[PDB]
Amino acid sequence: MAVSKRPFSINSFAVNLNIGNFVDARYWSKCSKIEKTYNTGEYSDGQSNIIYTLPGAIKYPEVVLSKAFSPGDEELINRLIAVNSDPIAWVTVFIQPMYRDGYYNVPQGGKIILEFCTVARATPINEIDTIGSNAAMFECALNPSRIRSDGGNINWWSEPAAQ
Amino acid sequence: MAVSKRPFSINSFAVNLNIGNFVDARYWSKCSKIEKTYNTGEYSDGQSNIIYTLPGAIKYPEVVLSKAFSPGDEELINRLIAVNSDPIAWVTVFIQPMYRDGYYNVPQGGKIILEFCTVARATPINEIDTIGSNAAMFECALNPSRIRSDGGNINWWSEPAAQ
Amino acid sequence: AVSKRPFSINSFAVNLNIGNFVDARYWSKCSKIEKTYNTGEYSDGQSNIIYTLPGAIKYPEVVLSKAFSPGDEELINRLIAVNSDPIAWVTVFIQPMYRDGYYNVPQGGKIILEFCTVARATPINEIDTIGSNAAMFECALNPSRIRSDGGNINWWSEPAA
Amino acid sequence: AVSKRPFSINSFAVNLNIGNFVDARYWSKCSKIEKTYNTGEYSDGQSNIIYTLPGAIKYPEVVLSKAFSPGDEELINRLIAVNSDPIAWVTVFIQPMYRDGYYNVPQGGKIILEFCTVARATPINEIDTIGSNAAMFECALNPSRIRSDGGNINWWSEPAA
Amino acid sequence: MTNFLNGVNIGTPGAYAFYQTTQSRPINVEPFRTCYMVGFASNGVNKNVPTRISNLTDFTNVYGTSASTNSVDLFFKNSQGFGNLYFVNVAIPTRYQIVVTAATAGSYSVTVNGVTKAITVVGGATTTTIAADVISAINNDTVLNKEVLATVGGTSSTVVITSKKPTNTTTAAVTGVIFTLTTTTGTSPSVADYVYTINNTFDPALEAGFVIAPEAFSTFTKSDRLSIQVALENLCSAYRYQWAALIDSGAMSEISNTDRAIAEAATYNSVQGHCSYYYPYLINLDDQQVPPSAAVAGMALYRFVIDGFAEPPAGVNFPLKGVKNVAYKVTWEEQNVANPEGVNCILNKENYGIVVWGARTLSADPNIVFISTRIILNIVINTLNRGYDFDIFNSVGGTATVLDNIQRKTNTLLTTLYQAGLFYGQTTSEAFSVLGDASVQVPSLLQQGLVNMFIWVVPSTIIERLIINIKQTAIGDLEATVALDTAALQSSVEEGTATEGTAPV
């Protein structure tokens, strides 16, 4: 009916972390998929032989962040390694969608916030090879507990349970 | 923002071994990832139906070093084969990051030390093929117990645990 | 209405800054200067037309060439060592000018390729004891940004709000 | 017996609309203009002949070129930034005409490539300090639709309704 | 606007809090999100000057008392900060009444704005003849005929000189005993003053939008209401504005029922449908019957922002806020007779509220029946005019590239409107077409400075009546019945035989 705006690209997001009480200013170039999965059970109404699906046991799957391993990542390594040691502490992931050309980010809407994440894997070095040419990749797996949306004119994620 | 210090490459690390009481001068060409893996369980707070992840049972996964099988590696073979025979002997892995152009390494920071590693596999010859042209690969799999760093001015693997 | 004539392919002067070193040598050949958009494909679901989504900008490799001449040994030794320092970058300056002999007429600023890394250095293109071509120094650079801030034309400007 | 001479390859004027600004510059070279059907293969089972099924229309990339001349800095700075705005598009206007000198004789509307995105901007095709060719500005566009409603022939009507 | 300057008058560094006041919504410059209200206020601050109003408080502060206060309040309540309101205070012209006492013979003169007219009286003269001579001299003078108008007052021995330019200073004086001067000025504006303000106060550069005169329509009589309707029709259909006007019924005591509203609308004429008539006065929360226009316009501008600019000021989804009831209950049959005649009813639907249940114009042209089409055409025209304003007064060099550039700009603007959704068609080729190149420009006209552009558009339509044709099927045969009937219906629509027939009541 009308083609007004281009869609978001796969490069159209900025990823930041809050590790415990530390507001880490480093950015992550890659993030894995973001979902709300429903574990399912099968049932019948007894009046047919069709298998129905019963949603339950919501889960937000693992999110893998990755970036280029650079000096100044020692604070990142130590903070991610130590965050799980404090039962009160957990990681927050801020994803800001945007329509950046170069360094010309134009963010619209709020940020998708993965709230209450626990570290499951910290990989400062993905691989070593004296003949390899790729950039060493810092990797970090996180298990989020909730997703919300904060700031901005557009709310991306809102859960219903409580009204 | 501004890329001031170009990130580390996967060829930007030098790997050395301490087999028991022996300090081996041989340098290795490859190494797998260095990680702090958290085993995880599932739970619920009861007042909702989201699956929450509980970390536990720390583990540092197996690390596979590899180099080119060259003369003078027979001492390395014998030491790696015999190290596990002594319940007191351990294998230590030293990884020094560095920005090597050629032979022009410039180290920065200490060295990531995998402490108290046990040999799980020693493969002097990856395979034999009289038509093959690849260099024969020496491989060694190690199971580390701890990770630290002490020989420089960065200290990028500080755990809060040890004594 | 032919007034101002267009730039000729020889209407540019090329200079380098190699780390903290400013080289006074000039380069007589440079490849295309470009901004490339790597493209993905998508659909709106309302039609079977393929749409192109730009992203992942990259400035492709630029190959400079000049005549291999005495006094190029320091240029060689600097280009070899640039990458050894993770904080050293090559900077390429292209000045457009209406040149006639040694008479230049620069107008506008100089297009600057910033934060370039050396990917290849070829002091000698080839050797032929009965050849007659001039030996050509070549050097390939991977740039990371293009700007311009001299002169009065600002050839290249990025949206920066 | 030919009553009307056919169009020459020089019989078209090319213009650009970049975002909300109208460019006064003309382009001297444009590549092929197409409507391409991506094809699948199938069978009716009645025979072993391979049948072709059209689908997934696409208008292939169009490469415009012109002589890099002063006053092209504005065009550069706009083509670089057009993609930065998801609302902005590049629109290409091709007016066929019979020209001898500056005496173009247009007939019919103009082919309009609408909703085009920049995939490549090459201000300088190459540099050769002893070369003689004119420097060629180049631009690559990924059109999404083609129409024509500027005149009295309408040679690119879709099957709309 | 506010919420940002709180920490400006603090010199100390630190962190403070200020409890967040209200923030204004800035309204953009889309050609059709403004409403111009022509009203009167004895406080003549902005006589015949369209002034932006931020809110009802600003209106009261500037203009004080005014019969348009209720309409302004309704507009702001319904617009909810969207759209702009421009008030036009009608200027009351100066007036000078000269009574000619007798026919005394002699030489006298009459002064108007410093221009003196000598008048000579001889034997056989009369008061009426002298007054007529003065009127003729003033009206046939080349200078005064444009500044003022001279007519006969309530007596043949009286002359009334009315300022033809209300804002300008008008002065009169006499040189003669028979002429007795008196200064006068209607303490309230009249229909002629309203007509002048309507016809001579709107700069085409002004943002397009709605035009309303609720005070005039509520106060004036039938003849004056017709005159003001004609003035608004001429304004909105003028080739320079192409706006839309909202006409209201008279006072409900006069237009008691729907038949009288139909008669008044029938008297009203709008060939191209620039004027749209509404009837029930909207009793607000303070129980005052306020002419519909302002409330409707407020809702319209709000709807334009939310629903869309192709959406007409109507619907149950977009009701009316700030009111509680309608001054009259329109029956279904009354509305059935009225709506085809151009009367847009406002109804108190239960479970919806006060809703405008009409979107028709006063035109007899079937192509511009709905006000949405009129608004779409006005938006197109005004967008193009604003775009070309920057192209006016531009040299036409040798290339004649300005005509090409104008076609380029037209294509861009019409594509923007297409994305906005104002046209019927899946593609721009289905939506619109332009022709403005040099092939249609004549050098003779170019020498005078004329450029001709030709544009074709296909405005979107709306859903007015939805017809449900559903059949009651016996148990078992639903699939076969549906297959057969659907085949028949699809075939008829495809081959174009669906329309062939007689429309039933």
Side-chain angles (χ1 to χ4, degrees):
Chain A
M1 192 32 206
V3 197
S4 53
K5 189 113 83 113
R6 301 203 253 271
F8 288 107
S9 175
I10 221 72
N11 78 44
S12 279
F13 308 85
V15 181
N16 278 315
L17 288 186
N18 256 15
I19 304 154
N21 299 119
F22 299 119
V23 177
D24 212 290
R26 278 163 281 276
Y27 273 70
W28 295 77
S29 53
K30 316 167 135 273
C31 179
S32 82
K33 84 154 145 54
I34 290 154
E35 299 194 348
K36 169 183 190 181
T37 61
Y38 281 107
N39 297 326
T40 48
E42 286 167 353
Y43 73 96
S44 177
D45 61 351
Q47 191 172 8
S48 67
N49 59 348
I50 295 162
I51 294 160
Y52 301 127
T53 291
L54 194 53
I58 304 181
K59 193 195 189 355
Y60 301 96
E62 229 152 89
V63 169
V64 183
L65 304 170
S66 171
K67 62 180 236 70
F69 181 47
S70 64
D73 285 321
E74 64 260 2
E75 313 66 349
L76 210 55
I77 295 169
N78 296 319
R79 282 181 195 158
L80 283 179
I81 263 53
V83 71
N84 282 357
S85 90
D86 180 340
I88 294 311
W90 28 65
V91 180
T92 323
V93 190
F94 300 89
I95 295 115
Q96 172 60 275
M98 77 186 27
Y99 269 114
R100 60 187 174 189
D101 196 83
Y103 280 100
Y104 175 66
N105 329 317
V106 69
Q108 69 293 298
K111 339 167 82 63
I112 301 159
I113 307 172
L114 320 184
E115 277 269 52
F116 306 107
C117 311
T118 46
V119 171
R121 189 158 61 73
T123 321
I125 302 156
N126 66 303
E127 177 208 42
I128 297 164
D129 176 7
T130 40
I131 291 171
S133 306
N134 313 331
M137 290 277 102
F138 196 130
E139 223 164 341
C140 176
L142 307 168
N143 287 119
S145 324
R146 175 149 167 285
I147 303 189
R148 82 168 279 196
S149 171
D150 206 5
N153 31 48
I154 297 152
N155 193 271
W156 309 98
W157 205 297
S158 85
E159 314 273 31
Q163 273 73 65
Chain B
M1 28 168 59
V3 282
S4 48
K5 177 63 154 273
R6 237 180 299 153
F8 283 108
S9 174
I10 85 171
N11 65 263
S12 283
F13 306 84
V15 184
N16 278 319
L17 288 185
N18 254 18
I19 298 115
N21 287 119
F22 293 120
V23 177
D24 267 45
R26 257 89 49 190
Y27 289 61
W28 297 78
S29 319
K30 314 169 152 254
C31 182
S32 71
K33 27 158 202 176
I34 294 65
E35 281 184 10
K36 180 184 187 173
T37 277
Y38 287 92
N39 270 67
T40 50
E42 313 278 50
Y43 77 94
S44 176
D45 59 344
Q47 288 333 93
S48 95
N49 75 347
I50 297 155
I51 289 150
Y52 302 132
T53 292
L54 189 53
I58 295 204
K59 158 164 263 298
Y60 299 97
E62 187 208 62
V63 77
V64 177
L65 312 188
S66 150
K67 68 183 282 312
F69 178 49
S70 68
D73 288 338
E74 71 277 0
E75 40 259 12
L76 178 71
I77 294 163
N78 295 319
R79 295 213 262 249
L80 280 176
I81 263 64
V83 74
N84 285 350
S85 77
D86 175 3
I88 276 301
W90 299 96
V91 177
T92 317
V93 184
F94 295 88
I95 292 113
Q96 171 60 273
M98 50 154 75
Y99 282 111
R100 36 146 132 267
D101 195 46
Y103 284 95
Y104 182 58
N105 46 76
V106 310
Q108 47 269 308
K111 46 226 299 176
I112 304 159
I113 308 170
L114 323 184
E115 277 274 46
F116 308 110
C117 317
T118 47
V119 168
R121 174 162 66 73
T123 310
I125 300 155
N126 58 334
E127 40 104 350
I128 298 172
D129 184 349
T130 296
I131 297 324
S133 318
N134 307 340
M137 281 312 84
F138 195 137
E139 319 179 50
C140 177
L142 307 170
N143 286 119
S145 302
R146 215 176 95 72
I147 303 183
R148 52 93 60 93
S149 61
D150 72 318
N153 80 93
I154 287 161
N155 164 329
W156 29 28
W157 246 100
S158 64
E159 299 273 28
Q163 284 84 240
Chain C
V2 234
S3 352
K4 187 75 119 160
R5 282 192 287 285
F7 283 118
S8 172
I9 221 73
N10 63 19
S11 295
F12 304 82
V14 188
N15 275 320
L16 287 181
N17 259 36
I18 304 163
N20 295 110
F21 285 125
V22 172
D23 276 53
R25 289 157 271 291
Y26 296 92
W27 298 75
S28 61
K29 302 190 82 293
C30 175
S31 68
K32 85 174 145 33
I33 297 100
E34 210 174 65
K35 165 150 133 162
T36 300
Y37 279 96
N38 281 351
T39 37
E41 269 161 359
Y42 76 96
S43 174
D44 62 353
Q46 312 255 21
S47 62
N48 59 354
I49 296 161
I50 293 131
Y51 298 127
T52 282
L53 193 59
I57 296 173
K58 107 175 297 293
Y59 305 92
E61 187 170 89
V62 172
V63 181
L64 304 172
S65 330
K66 69 184 232 74
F68 179 49
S69 62
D72 286 6
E73 61 275 335
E74 49 289 47
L75 180 48
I76 298 161
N77 291 320
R78 282 144 161 197
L79 289 174
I80 305 321
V82 201
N83 289 347
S84 60
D85 188 8
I87 343 221
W89 322 89
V90 201
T91 347
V92 190
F93 308 73
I94 301 98
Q95 173 71 62
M97 57 186 40
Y98 283 112
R99 170 160 64 206
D100 207 77
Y102 284 93
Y103 183 52
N104 308 342
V105 186
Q107 72 283 289
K110 29 163 51 58
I111 307 139
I112 307 164
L113 319 178
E114 338 181 80
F115 304 105
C116 312
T117 61
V118 173
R120 172 180 117 229
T122 319
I124 296 155
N125 48 317
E126 93 210 56
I127 292 163
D128 192 354
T129 282
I130 46 186
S132 303
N133 285 317
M136 299 289 303
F137 198 142
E138 262 174 7
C139 157
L141 308 169
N142 289 124
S144 301
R145 218 179 81 83
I146 308 179
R147 90 184 258 202
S148 65
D149 261 319
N152 50 27
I153 284 170
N154 173 345
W155 301 94
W156 195 291
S157 318
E158 288 283 328
Chain D
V2 164
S3 58
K4 177 84 151 218
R5 235 131 55 212
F7 281 124
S8 178
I9 220 76
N10 62 23
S11 289
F12 303 81
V14 183
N15 275 323
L16 285 184
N17 253 31
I18 304 163
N20 296 276
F21 163 62
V22 176
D23 319 303
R25 273 153 294 287
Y26 282 97
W27 295 77
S28 69
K29 302 192 80 313
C30 176
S31 71
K32 64 167 154 93
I33 287 93
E34 295 218 35
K35 158 157 194 211
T36 285
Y37 292 87
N38 275 110
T39 36
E41 282 146 356
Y42 78 96
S43 169
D44 61 356
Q46 285 298 29
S47 79
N48 62 356
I49 295 160
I50 308 187
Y51 298 96
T52 286
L53 192 54
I57 291 161
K58 100 184 303 312
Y59 304 92
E61 184 185 62
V62 172
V63 182
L64 308 174
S65 321
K66 72 184 230 73
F68 178 49
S69 60
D72 286 0
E73 64 272 2
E74 146 50 1
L75 190 63
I76 294 151
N77 295 322
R78 288 211 163 247
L79 283 173
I80 293 330
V82 77
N83 283 354
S84 64
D85 186 358
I87 289 330
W89 297 94
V90 171
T91 299
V92 193
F93 296 66
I94 299 102
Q95 174 67 44
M97 46 187 50
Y98 287 109
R99 34 188 171 195
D100 217 57
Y102 291 80
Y103 172 56
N104 42 61
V105 173
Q107 72 282 114
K110 47 189 42 168
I111 290 91
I112 310 170
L113 318 192
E114 40 188 11
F115 308 108
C116 313
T117 63
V118 171
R120 207 184 85 214
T122 319
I124 297 156
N125 49 331
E126 67 143 341
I127 293 166
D128 187 353
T129 289
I130 50 175
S132 320
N133 305 343
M136 305 290 322
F137 185 113
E138 250 169 326
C139 179
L141 305 170
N142 292 125
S144 305
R145 225 176 73 82
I146 312 184
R147 66 173 308 209
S148 54
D149 301 77
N152 75 282
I153 289 172
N154 173 281
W155 28 46
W156 230 100
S157 156
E158 274 316 348
Chain E
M1 257 34 58
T2 59
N3 312 92
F4 297 85
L5 302 321
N6 295 177
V8 159
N9 312 133
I10 322 204
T12 352
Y16 328 93
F18 285 88
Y19 274 106
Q20 223 181 311
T21 83
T22 137
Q23 224 241 206
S24 135
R25 329 238 4 160
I27 300 310
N28 314 106
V29 270
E30 295 302 320
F32 228 88
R33 49 197 304 199
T34 307
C35 189
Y36 303 87
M37 178 191 289
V38 170
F40 169 68
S42 66
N43 159 302
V45 290
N46 296 121
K47 291 164 66 166
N48 287 344
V49 174
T51 299
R52 217 187 94 80
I53 309 305
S54 293
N55 54 9
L56 181 66
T57 304
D58 168 307
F59 179 82
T60 298
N61 285 328
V62 173
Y63 300 87
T65 295
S66 175
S68 297
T69 310
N70 288 324
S71 294
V72 169
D73 171 72
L74 281 190
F75 173 94
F76 282 114
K77 282 231 190 303
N78 282 289
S79 65
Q80 318 181 15
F82 300 103
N84 317 304
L85 182 58
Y86 278 70
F87 188 74
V88 191
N89 194 355
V90 174
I92 306 172
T94 311
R95 224 212 306 284
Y96 288 108
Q97 185 210 333
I98 292 168
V99 194
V100 72
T101 61
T104 304
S107 82
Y108 320 105
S109 81
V110 185
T111 293
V112 183
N113 284 324
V115 181
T116 298
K117 299 286 284 188
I119 311 294
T120 53
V121 191
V122 294
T126 69
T127 58
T128 59
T129 299
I130 292 160
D133 154 46
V134 172
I135 285 160
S136 294
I138 290 165
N139 272 317
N140 314 38
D141 197 354
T142 36
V143 176
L144 293 309
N145 62 357
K146 285 123 208 175
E147 282 135 71
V148 309
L149 168 85
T151 56
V152 278
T155 299
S156 295
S157 64
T158 310
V159 175
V160 173
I161 300 154
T162 321
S163 174
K164 205 169 282 185
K165 293 175 168 66
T167 53
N168 261 19
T169 289
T170 301
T171 66
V174 289
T175 311
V177 303
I178 56 172
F179 301 139
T180 295
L181 184 74
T182 62
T183 203
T184 49
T185 305
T187 49
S188 299
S190 70
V191 72
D193 311 335
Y194 270 88
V195 170
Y196 183 99
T197 292
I198 288 159
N199 284 324
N200 301 300
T201 309
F202 300 103
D203 186 1
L206 285 171
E207 203 137 283
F210 299 106
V211 187
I212 63 182
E215 178 178 356
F217 282 111
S218 63
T219 297
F220 281 108
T221 67
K222 205 202 171 43
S223 168
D224 299 334
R225 276 196 314 269
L226 173 56
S227 296
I228 294 186
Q229 182 272 331
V230 160
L232 287 168
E233 169 60 26
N234 286 329
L235 171 71
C236 287
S237 68
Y239 48 103
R240 55 180 185 290
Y241 297 113
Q242 292 285 318
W243 294 0
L246 307 183
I247 311 308
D248 306 25
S249 65
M252 314 280 327
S253 62
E254 189 175 2
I255 323 305
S256 62
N257 67 10
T258 303
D259 189 330
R260 294 179 184 181
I262 289 165
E264 203 185 10
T267 53
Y268 296 171
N269 270 288
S270 183
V271 173
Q272 306 244 48
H274 291 275
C275 295
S276 296
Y277 186 74
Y278 295 90
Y279 155 69
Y281 274 21
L282 285 192
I283 339 190
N284 57 12
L285 304 171
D286 352 298
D287 290 67
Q288 330 273 342
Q289 287 169 2
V290 197
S293 56
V296 183
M299 183 251 322
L301 301 189
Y302 172 61
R303 176 147 165 143
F304 283 161
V305 186
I306 320 281
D307 224 357
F309 272 78
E311 298 286 303
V316 266
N317 25 66
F318 277 85
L320 294 146
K321 14 251 138 11
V323 281
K324 19 130 258 149
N325 235 285
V326 271
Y328 179 80
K329 198 165 152 59
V330 184
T331 64
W332 188 95
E333 312 73 311
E334 285 169 349
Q335 186 170 9
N336 198 21
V337 172
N339 200 32
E341 299 301 323
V343 183
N344 288 319
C345 303
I346 290 161
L347 306 169
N348 189 0
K349 300 279 196 186
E350 316 327 343
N351 314 127
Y352 301 120
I354 314 299
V355 303
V356 178
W357 208 240
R360 276 173 184 259
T361 67
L362 290 157
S363 176
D365 189 351
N367 300 324
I368 310 161
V369 159
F370 296 115
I371 191 181
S372 64
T373 301
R374 182 71 266 156
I375 288 163
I376 284 161
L377 296 169
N378 294 341
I379 281 164
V380 172
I381 284 168
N382 285 290
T383 303
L384 292 164
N385 287 350
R386 295 320 97 207
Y388 297 156
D389 271 8
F390 304 82
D391 282 295
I392 305 296
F393 292 122
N394 277 338
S395 184
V396 175
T399 65
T401 35
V402 191
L403 299 316
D404 169 83
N405 296 1
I406 289 163
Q407 201 167 6
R408 312 264 208 90
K409 211 201 216 278
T410 307
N411 167 262
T412 298
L413 290 160
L414 287 181
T415 305
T416 290
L417 290 183
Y418 171 73
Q419 304 311 32
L422 273 58
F423 303 130
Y424 185 93
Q426 330 150 297
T427 58
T428 59
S429 63
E430 280 199 326
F432 62 87
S433 176
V434 181
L435 175 64
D437 72 89
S439 74
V440 286
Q441 308 312 330
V442 190
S444 74
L445 308 175
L446 287 173
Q447 210 77 83
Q448 305 175 4
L450 281 151
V451 184
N452 266 297
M453 176 78 45
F454 301 94
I455 290 152
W456 303 263
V457 291
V458 175
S460 301
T461 190
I462 53 162
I463 297 165
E464 197 203 12
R465 302 147 283 153
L466 200 145
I467 304 317
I468 318 175
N469 309 272
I470 211 68
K471 204 223 278 301
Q472 184 230 336
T473 305
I475 85 185
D477 60 306
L478 185 127
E479 80 301 1
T481 310
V482 170
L484 196 82
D485 295 354
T486 315
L489 297 162
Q490 303 255 259
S491 268
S492 62
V493 174
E494 184 244 329
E495 68 201 335
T497 57
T499 317
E500 328 313 4
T502 52
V505 75

